[PDB]
Amino acid sequence: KPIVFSGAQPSGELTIGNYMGALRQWVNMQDDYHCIYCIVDQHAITVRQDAQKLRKATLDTLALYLACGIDPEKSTIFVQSHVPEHAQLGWALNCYTYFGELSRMTQAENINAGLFDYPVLMAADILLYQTNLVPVGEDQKQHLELSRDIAQRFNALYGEIFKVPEPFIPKSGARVMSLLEPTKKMSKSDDNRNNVIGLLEDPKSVVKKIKRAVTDSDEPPVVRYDVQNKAGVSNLLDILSAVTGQSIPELEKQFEGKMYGHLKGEVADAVSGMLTELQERYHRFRNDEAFLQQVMKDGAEKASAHASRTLKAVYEAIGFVAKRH
Amino acid sequence: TKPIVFSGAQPSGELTIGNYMGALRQWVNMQDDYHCIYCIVDQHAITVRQDAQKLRKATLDTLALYLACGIDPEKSTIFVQSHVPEHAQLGWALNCYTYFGELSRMTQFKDKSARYAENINAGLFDYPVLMAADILLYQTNLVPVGEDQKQHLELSRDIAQRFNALYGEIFKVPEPFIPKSGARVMSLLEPTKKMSKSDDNRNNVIGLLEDPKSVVKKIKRAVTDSDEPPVVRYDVQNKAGVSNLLDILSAVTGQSIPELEKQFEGKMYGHLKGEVADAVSGMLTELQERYHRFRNDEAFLQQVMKDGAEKASAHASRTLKAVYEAIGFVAKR
Ligand SMILES: Nc1ncnc2c1ncn2[C@@H]1O[C@H](COP(=O)(O)OC(=O)[C@@H](N)Cc2c[nH]c3ccccc23)[C@@H](O)[C@H]1O
Ligand SMILES: O=c1[nH]c2cc(Cl)ccc2o1
């Protein structure tokens, strides 16, 4: 099975876009690939933040990934800082990364060195596990390209130590746009929280956010799919289709002679119907301390076994004297 | 418990009389008075591109050389940097409390960048952060280094103070221990330039493992000055070469500059160089004699590395656990 690496940021609260897009896609491919989910707490600290909230958010993220259906018995899920090899390989790859490559990243004296240097750590995160495939958003494409360049550069000097990773090209295909701005994709980082539906929102909050969702001034109101002229209504249809599995033409027929109130009502009920099973699993996992501790221990153990084999090969190539165990 | 001493040296090139006088001499003398921890910094060495066989051999050379100098594994913790993962771990964490501008302004990064233009790498840039992690891991009170490491030392103090101010007394604030004499030994044919163990021109350098005969010849050819009459007087601005020779003689013999100036009153650079060459030849002959006994005893070197990494790991894991708890990581099981 090809090895797939994903970094999970411990800060973002996941939206229905994150879930019905990438996450649901990957949950159903856990037997197809050897999937690795790394909760990236070492990446998080490049932004100064409250310590207790970082600890909490690491555990929130673990429980939510578990709730969404990541299976600890099929996939490897772990906390980045629990596997020292990340930092170790990161230092080594720092020495085969050009300073120029980091300064050319699309992102002066007062930024912290972590924010400058984290694409090297990202390269180490991927290359440690002999990763074949990395799912990346547009913003992470430069970083993946750097990891490929580093891998090839090191391999040219020392032999085939690393796999050259490839982007995971096919996208989930569920379209989820922002509620008050239907041209912009729904993103966890959005400042306007009314643009998004988080995975932990109760039915009252979802009704409220969906009721405010932008539509159009068509007279009579008509539930028809048209991204150019009816962005808002189209987004509502795409969300409803994503939840229920009903086709757009089927939904267009279902809402014949119906107004946007009826659409919104069903969108809110559909979305909340999806989130209640998800929230039940989340709160059950999140408050089982022993379960979460066991997932983290098992995950770190699986990760370290793989990571240590790569690091040993890297260290031997560079020429370091092997540790006396 | 005793205050803690920590210092390191790279297994890159062959250590010089400069490395000895600025660092290793002080290391040896601090062993009973403080709890001393000495590191072969192989992770720092690779910021300059090394041949893999050269690096491995130089790591072991450097270890045997510490032992030959009088570093005693019964008194001091002696270890190889890459054997203790906590250095890289804490290094990453401290990256996040270090500013870009603090690193770009470093003289060492600038000098090494000019020298290795085809390999201006991120490790070379990030050099001081790993060095701060090396020091701060061991609750270090004193850091014996040469003058050239002063700026790096100062940043490690700033990082420690900065981190402590947010999170409490996690680190000790280290202090530099730079000797009065021999802190900046200069090149023999270019006494305005620091003696570098990887100098292209070997005649600039007195290597610790260099044939004494070769070293005596280098001392006789060291540049002095045009003063008429020749006078042996310490004066860095006007008499760089003569001063460097005096500095070297002082550090080997133990005699002060006034004592040496008095000794050479009415004498010229023949006497100065004759004495420097004799003192240094004798030191290197004896040093190299103990060195080969250690260097060819692989079982002893293996045991020293094993015991040292064990002792180091005990301290390092303790500090890292506290750092991780403070910054807010979920503790490993
Ligand atoms: N010409 C000279 N005259 C006098 N002293 C000199 C001369 N050349 C070098 N030194 C000193 O020798 C020690 C080792 O040099 P390195 O280049 O390995 O030194 C270096 O490159 C350090 N970054 C290694 C290091 C890594 N981590 C540490 C933590 C604490 C102390 C030191 C370290 C140093 O003390 C250096 O100041
Ligand atoms: O000091 C440092 N810088 C580092 C950068 C990476 Cl990616 C990893 C470890 C490090 O330690």
Phi and psi (nearest 5°) for A31?
-90, -20
B79 plus B178 within the same structural domain = yes
Backbone φ and ψ of B6, nearest 5° = -135, 135
Half-sphere exposure of B179 (CA within 13 A, CB side): 24
A89, A124 Cβ separation under 8 angstroms: yes
For the residues of A21-51, what is the DSSP string, one character each?
IIIHHHHTTTTTSEEEEEE-HHHHTTS---H
Evaluate: CB of B65 within 6 angstroms of ligand 1.
Answer: no
Q: Record the resolution, in angstroms.
A: 2.0
Q: Minimal CA–CA distance to A146: which of A125, A119, A114?
A: A119
Are residue B214 and residue B245 in the same domain, yes or no? yes
Q: Could you give the CA distance from residue A97 to residue A88 in angstroms, rounded to a whole number?
A: 15
Name the nearest CA neighbour of B135 among B121, B109, B154.
B154
Decide if B193 is catalytic.
no
Please tell me the distance from the alpha carbon of residue B179 to that of residue B157, in angstroms, as a whole number.
19
d(CA B160, CA B323): 11
> Is B149 a pocket residue for ligand 1 (Cβ < 6 Å)?
yes
Catalytic residue among B54, B75, B150, B197: B197
User: Residue B297 burial by CB count (10 A; 0-12/13-18/19+): exposed, middle or buried?
Assistant: middle
Question: A102-133 burial by CB neighbour count: b if 16+ within 10 A, else e?
Answer: beeeeeeeeebbbbbbbbbbbbbbbbbbbbbb
The answer on A296 and A283 residing in a single domain is: no
- Do A215 and A169 belong to one domain? no
Are residues B178 and B190 located together in one domain of the fold? no
Question: Is B130 in the same domain as B37?
Answer: yes
Q: Is B328 helix (H, G, I), strand (E, B) or coil?
A: coil
Distances (CA, A) of B187 to A47, A271, B252, B278: 45, 75, 17, 19
Is B147 annotated in a binding site? The answer is yes
| CA distance linking residue A87 with residue B178, whole number of Å | 31
- Shared domain for B57 and B151, answered yes or no, is yes
Q: What's the CA-to-centroid distance between B18 and ligand 1, angstroms?
A: 9
Interface of A with B in 202-221 (CB under 8 A): none
* Token pair listed for A176: 């989820």
Tally Cβ neighbours within 10 Å of residue A150.
24
Using a 10 angstrom Cβ sphere, with 0-12 exposed, 13-18 middle and 19 or more buried, the burial of residue A191 is: exposed
DSSP lists the bridge partners of residue B99 as A112
The structure tokens listed for A252 are 């267009």
On the 0-12 / 13-18 / 19+ scale of CB atoms within 10 A, A42 is buried
User: Range of A170's domain?
Assistant: 1-175+289-325
Phi-psi region of A302 (alpha: psi -120 to 50; beta: other; left: phi over 0): alpha
Residues across chain B: 333
The amino acid at B229: P
CA-based nearest residue to A271, from A223, A199, A215, A216: A199
Q: Which amino acid makes up residue A288?
A: D
Considering the domain architecture, whether residues B226 and B138 belong to the same structural domain is answered as: no
Cα distance between residue A3 and residue A125, in whole Å: 13
Chain B residues closer than 8 Å to A48 by CB: 96
| B262 is a catalytic site residue | no
| Cis ω before A220 (30° cut-off from 0) | yes
Number of domains making up chain A: 2
Residue B306 annotated as catalytic: no
For residues A169 and A214, state if they share a domain: no
Shared-domain flag, residues A294 and A187? no
The CA distances from residue B331 to A81, A86, B321, B323, in Å, are 9, 16, 8, 11
Q: Which of B53, B170, B310 is nearest to A320 (CA)?
A: B53
Closest ligand to Cα A88: 2
Taking alpha carbons only, the member of A173, A262, A279, A160 closest to residue A221 is A262
Q: How many CB pairs under 8 A join A and B?
A: 166
Structure tokens at A10: 């411990």
Of B75, B241, B268, B258, nearest in space to B180 by CA: B258
Name the method of structure determination: X-ray
Q: Is any atom of ligand 1 closer than 6 Å to the C-beta of B130?
A: no
Do B224 and B253 fall within a single domain?
yes
- Residues A211 and A213: their CA atoms lie apart, in Å, by 6
Query: Ligand 2, closest atom to CA B90?
Result: 11
User: Distance of CA B215 to CAs A303, B31, B209, B272, B327, Å?
Assistant: 53, 29, 10, 15, 52
Cα angle at A128 between A123 and A133, to 5 degrees?
A: 70
What tokens does B101 get? 């501008």
Residue A16 and residue A5 share a domain? yes
**Triad B172, B178, B184: Cα angle to 5°:** 140
Top residue of B40, B62, B126, B130 to mutate, by most chain A CBs within 10 Å, is B126
Phi, psi of B316, rounded to the nearest 5 degrees:
-65, -45
Nearest CA-CA partner of B192 in B180, B206, B204: B204
> Counting Cβ atoms within 10 Å, is residue B81 exposed (0-12), middle (13-18) or buried (19+)?
buried
Residues of B in contact with A324 (CB under 8 A): 83, 302-303, 305-306, 309
